[PDB]
Design a protein around this nucleic acid. Sequence first.
RNA 1: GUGGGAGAGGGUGGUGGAAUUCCCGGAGUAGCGGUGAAAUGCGCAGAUACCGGGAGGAACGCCGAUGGCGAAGGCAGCCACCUGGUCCACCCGUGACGCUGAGGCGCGAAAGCGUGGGGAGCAAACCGGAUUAGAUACCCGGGUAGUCCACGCCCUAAACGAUGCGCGCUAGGUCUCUGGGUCUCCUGGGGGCCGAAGCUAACGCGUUAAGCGCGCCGCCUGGGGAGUACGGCCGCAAGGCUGAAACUCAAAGGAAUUGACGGGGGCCCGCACAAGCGGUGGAGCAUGUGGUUUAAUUCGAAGCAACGCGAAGAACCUUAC
RNA 2: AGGCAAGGAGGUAAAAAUGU
RNA 3: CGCGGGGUGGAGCAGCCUGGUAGCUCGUCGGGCUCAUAACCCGAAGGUCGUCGGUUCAAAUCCGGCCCCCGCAACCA
Lengths: 73, 119, 164, 155
Amino acid sequence: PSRKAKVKATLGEFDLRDYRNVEVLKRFLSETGKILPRRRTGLSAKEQRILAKTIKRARILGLLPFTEKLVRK
Amino acid sequence: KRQVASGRAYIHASYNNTIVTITDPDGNPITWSSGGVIGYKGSRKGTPYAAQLAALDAAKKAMAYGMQSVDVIVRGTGAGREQAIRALQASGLQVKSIVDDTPVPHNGCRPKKKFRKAS
Amino acid sequence: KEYLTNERIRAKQVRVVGPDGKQLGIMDTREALRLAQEMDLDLVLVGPNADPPVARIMDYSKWRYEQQMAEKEARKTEVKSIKFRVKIDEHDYQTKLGHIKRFLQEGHKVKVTIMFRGREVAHPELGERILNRVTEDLKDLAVVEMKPEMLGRDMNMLLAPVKV
Amino acid sequence: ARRRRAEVRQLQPDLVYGDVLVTAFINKIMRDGKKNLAARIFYDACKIIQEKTGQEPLKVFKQAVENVKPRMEVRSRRVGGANYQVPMEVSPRRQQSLALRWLVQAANQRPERRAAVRIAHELMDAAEGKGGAVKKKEDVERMAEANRAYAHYRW
RNA sequence: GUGGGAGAGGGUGGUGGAAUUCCCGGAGUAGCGGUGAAAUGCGCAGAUACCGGGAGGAACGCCGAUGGCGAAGGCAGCCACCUGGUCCACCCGUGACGCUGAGGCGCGAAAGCGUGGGGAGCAAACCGGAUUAGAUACCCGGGUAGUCCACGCCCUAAACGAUGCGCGCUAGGUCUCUGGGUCUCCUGGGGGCCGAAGCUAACGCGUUAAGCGCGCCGCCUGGGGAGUACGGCCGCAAGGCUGAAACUCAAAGGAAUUGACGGGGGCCCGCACAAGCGGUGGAGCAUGUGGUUUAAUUCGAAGCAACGCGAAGAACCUUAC
RNA sequence: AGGCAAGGAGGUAAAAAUGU
RNA sequence: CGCGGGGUGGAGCAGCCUGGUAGCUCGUCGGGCUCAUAACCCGAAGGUCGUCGGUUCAAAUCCGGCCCCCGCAACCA
Ligand SMILES: [Mg+2]
Ligand SMILES: [Mg+2]
Ligand SMILES: [Mg+2]
Ligand SMILES: [Mg+2]
Ligand SMILES: [Mg+2]
Ligand SMILES: [Mg+2]
Ligand SMILES: [Mg+2]
Ligand SMILES: [Mg+2]
Ligand SMILES: [Mg+2]
Ligand SMILES: [Mg+2]
Ligand SMILES: [Mg+2]
Ligand SMILES: [Mg+2]
Ligand SMILES: [Mg+2]
Ligand SMILES: [Mg+2]
Ligand SMILES: [Mg+2]
Ligand SMILES: [Mg+2]
Ligand SMILES: [Mg+2]
Ligand SMILES: [Mg+2]
């Protein structure tokens, strides 16, 4: 049931609403361009939602992937 | 008559037939194999063994164009995607990587009635 | 149905028949085999009962395949059997008629067959009465193939399309 | 047949050579429980083998068995509404048994007069890598390959 | 009122990729697709599968929830605009201004219809194939309306929490989301689950009550007849509201309980099937039976559990015909 | 490397009318 | 009269054309399967291929004539 690491936990203090912040953001996506859930990221419902929105915005621009590819298989 | 040594292997897989297309690293396909290519009509067309056979055939064809470098790309899921991959690994090519890639709609148009009930 | 090949052939002097419309005589099994090899078409015991067994020089498997294909083709275009009674109702009759009409439209031959009990005395007349009427009704689509003939425990009427 | 795996029987091995396989073969040969009938037959066959193809008759038999032992067999499962001939591995004892059965069948299927003789000939054929038993084995193998697709209905 | 907050609330204008199809371009060849099997279907004018672009239309993957919003129907890419509802905190302002609501007015999924557009997929009807005794069906190949938008109309629904709204009281815990705090705990507002008292026909309900009350509205008085007739209204139509009776039945029902049953599940078993040896059915005959024939073929036994059975001894006897 | 489990796959659960 | 196509187990139709080697469905009867009926499954029963010939070692099959059955025309008179 996945207990490797939490994305909020490995991290320090950061802003949610900056899409222009890709390094800290490419962390909440999957290896496939896909958003990690509550039980993989570790944020508040509200916070998670905000993050998701920001991710979407970024995608719309072109900062983060819409999707990519999983490898090795 | 083209000669390349280098490229990719798409395995597109429906549960009805696991198709394998070998292409150069552009995206121009030299040779391909599927179930019916290995005779196999109908039921068995998309069984794991069939898929494996197809993969082998594809590899053989590639070899007839001096081919070694092969990047795997699996599109969808059929009766034997994993088996096909295994065959490719074994077959006789320098495999790059097994790229897992579904042509999943980002909530597209309505699916068929068989693919209805998915809801 | 075994037309027998090569060394499925036990009989000594087999009548070695060619592929087409020729013969090589009544020769040994080995001889026959050799002949088959020469043509590369198998030696096939097509008439074992015959005055020494008839041994055709044909590729057996291919021939069998062809036969199978033919059989499949024959499977289909076809005949619909509409089963009436003596105790059958007016609405029911109408329904049956409609079905028959549909079949005719499609392009299917029609065995309107009546299924009887005891009283094969006041069965045949009723069978006629139903079936004749039905035929009369569907005349526009249907040329009657088989008339109402009582056949022991059943009765048949059959209809063929006038045109399709 | 739903509890323990149920033991294979502990054969009293051969009196002549000192082996269980031999005994099993004898038993297979014998119908109607007339053992010393068929044991004698087997011995006659062995003698024939020794004479005709000058070799140790147990060894020959073993070789024959080895030749006819099939590692892949076909079962049958109705799956979906279509009956697929299922290609699967064989357990060793079972395989051996099958081989024995086939040998016995071949011995009966042979066109000559006396059973012992027929048996001997069959065994010789098997040793060579030919005859009837071998053919049957080959057929079975083919079946477990012309159906090698449905393999995934893994029983 | 002020200070904030959460949110797929609604509308208007845009955009963002995946995907689909369709077009061109390329490489490439013998099948693809489809199924429980298959066939119709497309493909040598070269399909499918693969890459490059372009054309569209529709929908919004992941997040995404057992979650949030609305009064309900409902609502999700994202952004912008306009814009509702609401929640808290201060307790600051008003001084009972409230609660309910016959009618009325408004909204009201989906389908439907009208006018005009658009049309990729899906896809009623429809045309095929199989499947089948039959196939108007389930399954596949297309396929028209329709789905989509504008404007208009329709107004029904398992329009459900099958729970009318409003406030007051009556143990807790537990998880959730959302606000403030003196922030490992308090205190509001929502969403769930377990349960005190109590209620209930039981199931269950149980501070989001079906508890205890009060307020008002809606409706109910057996089922079928029937949401039908008849009127009346509304509607372009489909139909909708509004709503009987005559007759007919001694029931229609709910909730549980015991069983039985399930082509429901889990756990088990047996020569039950598999694994194997030998048959039965095919032959003659031995027998018993059904049927038939007879003057009588005595009578019974009936799927397993009747059929070398009563009969473990029919020439007469037995024996009953 | 095994150990359990969560999720995603895909394979399987065919068909089979009635009433003394 | 002229021309084309076909005549086949009881009925419908394959095979002919490409000489040897006759199939399916419906119907007949019996069995099975079922607690029982249909349905089902199986069989069993059942055709010398319209017929007379010839061909050829051998004809449903190559070929003629008759017998039919279908249809199309049948004109100048
Ligand atoms: Mg405010
Ligand atoms: Mg193209
Ligand atoms: Mg004050
Ligand atoms: Mg004052
Ligand atoms: Mg469609
Ligand atoms: Mg059909
Ligand atoms: Mg239809
Ligand atoms: Mg369809
Ligand atoms: Mg319209
Ligand atoms: Mg209601
Ligand atoms: Mg109200
Ligand atoms: Mg709410
Ligand atoms: Mg609460
Ligand atoms: Mg209590
Ligand atoms: Mg409760
Ligand atoms: Mg109550
Ligand atoms: Mg109504
Ligand atoms: Mg009216």
